[PDB]
Each structure stands twice: as structure tokens, then as C-alpha cells.
Amino acid sequence: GSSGSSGGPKTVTLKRTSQGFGFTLRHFIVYPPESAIQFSYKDEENGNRGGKQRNRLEPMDTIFVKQVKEGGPAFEAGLCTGDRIIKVNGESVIGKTYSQVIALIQNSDTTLELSVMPKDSGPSSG
């Protein structure tokens, strides 16, 4: 018997340990301006607000995992590499940005719940 979940959303719980949670994400697809470069040299840059007229076609596809510590929370939860994030802290992060889910992971308080989507797999039949 047994199976790698036959239909349904995957859920993984993590416990706040050493700030991090074993696994990690990948830096957000930078969104630098094509032509500009005329604002300070070494300092933050305005992000929020701007102008609801054109709006650059930003990427923001998915979070996607990077690595999974060896002997951490995620590792236990059953996380891995390549697993894409769909939900976070029972919070719908569909239209949310990586900068959002991040806070969620940081606002995990005690534990940090996540959710991915396992693909069809089966090395053995049984």
C-alpha cells in the first residue's frame, strides 16, 4: 500500500529553530529598471507606490525551494528541493508576493506551516 499522496494539497509543518527552518528560498527575481540609474549609489530604493498607469510586467511566478538542511524542521516535515510553495501558515499566498510569504515565515511565531505540490512518483510498486 502506501503512496505519495494521491490527489490533494500537500502540507508541511516546521518548528522555529535557530531563526531559519532548515530549508531556504531563492532570492526574488530582481526587477531592475531597463534604463535609469540616477538615484543614490549605495542605499535602499523606493518600491511600493509609483503609478497605476503602465506597471512593469514583473515575473513573480513561484517561490520554489532551494535546499533542505540535513536534520532540521523542513527536512522532517518531509520537504525537499524543487518543491514549490503554494500556501503558507494556512494563508493563501496565491496573489501574494515572495516578500509577503516571507513575513509569514517570519511571523511563524512558534511553528511555520507550508504547502507544496508533489508530482507523480513511484519507484516501487509494492
Curated annotation (Swiss-Prot):
Record note on modification: Sumoylated with SUMO2 and SUMO3 in proliferating lymphocytes.
PDZ domain location: 11-120
Induction record: Up-regulated upon cell differentiation.
Residues that bear Phosphoserine: S18
Tissue: Widely expressed with higher expression in brain, heart, skeletal muscle and placenta.
Annotated localization: Golgi apparatus membrane; Cell junction; Cytoplasmic vesicle membrane; Cytoplasm, Cytoskeleton
Highest rank taxon of the organism: Eukaryota
Role: Functions as a GTPase-activating protein (GAP) for RHOA and CDC42. Downstream partner of ARF1 which may control Golgi apparatus structure and function. Also required for CTNNA1 recruitment to adherens junctions.
Other known facts: Depletion of ARHGAP21 induces cell spreading and accumulation of F-actin stress fibers. Required for In1A-dependent entry of Listeria monocytogenes into cells.
Subunit structure: Interacts with GTP-bound ARF1 and ARF6. Interacts with CTNNA1.
Protein name, as recorded: Rho GTPase-activating protein 21
Gene that this sequence comes from: ARHGAP21
Residues of the full protein shown: 47 to 159 of 1958
